[PDB]
């Protein structure tokens, strides 16, 4: 139900 | 009338997650060489522990990164692991420098986005090997007789690390390690 694209988790990183 | 979410809530993930460190002790046993760091549930929670660990080249050899489902131990006899196996990548030793670390974070990425779609129950965890011969990245699968599962979640992954075509790998089942047969390549 909860998915999230990689760029999207990656701009989260800093 | 209320705050809106978006402004501050965390980003929360699917499933909870647990980070699990092997030290490469030979004096202690594989079971007490194998510790808890801690468990996250959102995505700021996830980097707020990636930012502060080693990189896996960075490790000492012998030692292993593991991020499972909450609830499901590291090891291949836990109820939800003993019935399936692991796409398994091989890396040379030239990968230490260049692969090692983007293949990981890439594998963190697949879990905790939920990247195989509706065989991510399946999905059990993954587990970085740092070796001297050369290091390992698996992902961990529930059941190794669930072809189409299985299938996919190979496919996926091996596409998301972007390796060539022509490199093939393999899935091993738990009981079979325990010299190793490929049940699945992709
Ligand atoms: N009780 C228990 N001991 C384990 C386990 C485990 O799950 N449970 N594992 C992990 C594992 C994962 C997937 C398939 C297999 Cl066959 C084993 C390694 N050990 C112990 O370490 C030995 C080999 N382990 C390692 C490798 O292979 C490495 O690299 C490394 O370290 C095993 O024969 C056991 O003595």
Same mark, same amino acid.
């Given at each position: 139900k909860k998915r999230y694209d990689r760029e999207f988790l990656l701009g989260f990183q800093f | 009338e209320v705050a809106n979410p978006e402004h501050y809530i965390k980003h929360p993930l699917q499933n909870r997650w647990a980070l699990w460190f092997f030290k490469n002790d030979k004096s202690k046993t594989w079971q007490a060489n194998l510790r808890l760091i801690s468990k996250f549930d959102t995505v700021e929670d996830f980097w707020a522990l990636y930012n502060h660990i080693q990189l896996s080249s960075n490790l000492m050899p012998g030692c292993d990164y593991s991020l499972?489902?909450?609830? &499901?131990?590291?090891?291949?006899?836990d109820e939800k692991n003993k019935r399936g196996g692991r796409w398994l990548i091989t890396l040379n030793k030239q990968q230490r420098r260049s692969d090692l670390d983007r293949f990981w974070l890439?594998?963190?990425?697949?879990?905790?986005?939920?990247?195989?779609?509706? #065989?991510?129950?399946?999905?059990?965890? *993954?587990?970085?090997?740092? !070796? *001297?011969?050369?290091?390992? &990245?698996? &992902?961990?699968?529930?059941?190794?007789?669930? !072809?189409? *599962?299985?299938?996919? &979640?190979? !496919?996926? #992954? @091996?596409?998301?690390?972007?390796?060539?075509? @022509?490199?093939?790998?393999? #899935?091993?089942?738990?009981?079979?390690?325990?010299?190793?047969?490929? !049940?699945?390549?992709?």
């Open positions: - | 499972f489902k909450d609830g &499901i131990e590291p090891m291949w006899e890439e594998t963190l990425l697949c879990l905790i986005g939920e990247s195989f779609d509706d #065989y991510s129950d399946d999905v059990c965890g *993954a587990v970085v090997n740092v !070796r *001297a011969k050369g290091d390992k &990245i698996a &992902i961990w699968t529930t059941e190794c007789e669930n !072809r189409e *599962a299985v299938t996919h &979640i190979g !496919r996926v #992954y @091996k596409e998301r690390l972007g390796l060539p075509p @022509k490199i093939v790998i393999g #899935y091993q089942s738990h009981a079979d390690t325990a010299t190793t047969k490929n !049940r699945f390549v992709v």
